[PDB]
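INPUT
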Amino acid sequence: RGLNQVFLIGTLTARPDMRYTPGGLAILDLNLAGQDAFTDESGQEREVPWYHRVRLLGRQAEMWGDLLEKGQLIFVEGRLEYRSEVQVRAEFIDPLEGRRRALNQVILMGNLTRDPDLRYTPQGTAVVRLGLAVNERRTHFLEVQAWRELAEWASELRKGDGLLVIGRLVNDSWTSSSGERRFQTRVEALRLERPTR
Amino acid sequence: RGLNQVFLIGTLTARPDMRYTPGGLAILDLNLAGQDAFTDESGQEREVPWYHRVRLLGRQAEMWGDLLEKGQLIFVEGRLEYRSEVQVRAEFIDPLEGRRRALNQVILMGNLTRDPDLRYTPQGTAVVRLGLAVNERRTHFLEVQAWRELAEWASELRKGDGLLVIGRLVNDSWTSSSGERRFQTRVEALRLERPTR
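OUTPUT
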């Protein structure tokens, strides 16, 4: 069966204010921030921020819509969705008193929508983009990026293969020929396994 | 609301064979193993094995009861329970082809059942045992251990306080005066936060 699970603790970058659909459904959008550590192409330990949108809809939005502050730490469990733009739809949140131990985890299980295409960065690090179809855990389509040894291993997979991903949500940069920078949320794989079948 | 969630990938240490309650309900008990890393009292990076029992009951037990092998990697999501003896009750499993990136994670949220009692090991490392009452996510009672700075911080909490724990499942040793060793599964806290309230 498909899986699509996200666990995050982050800090609110603005005060959330409730909004409503035209039908009256409550919407509470949170903008969360945190950091994660990585090792760069030259072996240096670094941190880079992540910023992600978390949407509460309906009962969770009404529950919290007048209780949260900019600067407050929030624990979220939810799923990845669109609205393009990958966002987290919260199943629930628990605001924290918040006065390392990073929490930014994603678990996906699904089937590749196309063959992986292995590339190498200019510095020769292996990298692959994988397209995954997840049947709720109709069909959702999610992009996953993997690096180094996991990219080389993922290159053996083919369209259709089942895949379990344990990863984290990151922000990727796209730069135009003229120096313009846009940002895209994606899943970075930290572990990949194959489900039996 | 309470939370009690466990995520594990481990290797089967024996072939699982289905058993039945007297009422016919299927039981499939898996014995899983893995490793986790820690830093010991002298700053040395070490690994120590974990061994944990995972129980499938009913439909998941029937689904997998003739399909799993000793040596096979299994992904589990479930909850902690007794049967004393802390075990994982699987919500579901996904056997893996399995031909680092450790997965042994527990998320608990509940309320302390007593004041924390801070101690120091002979080498002067801070350590605390916390008792947590979790109302399903009737009341379950679960023990959590925290070390070093998190033990010192946890010492400020009191019976009744809400607590979110992000941790992992470990095996603790008890040694009698005569050198006999027994083992106990417990949760080691890796992050602790306070839910608002």
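end of record. The domain at 102-197 of chain B is CATH 2.40.50.140 (OB fold (Dihydrolipoamide Acetyltransferase, E2P)).
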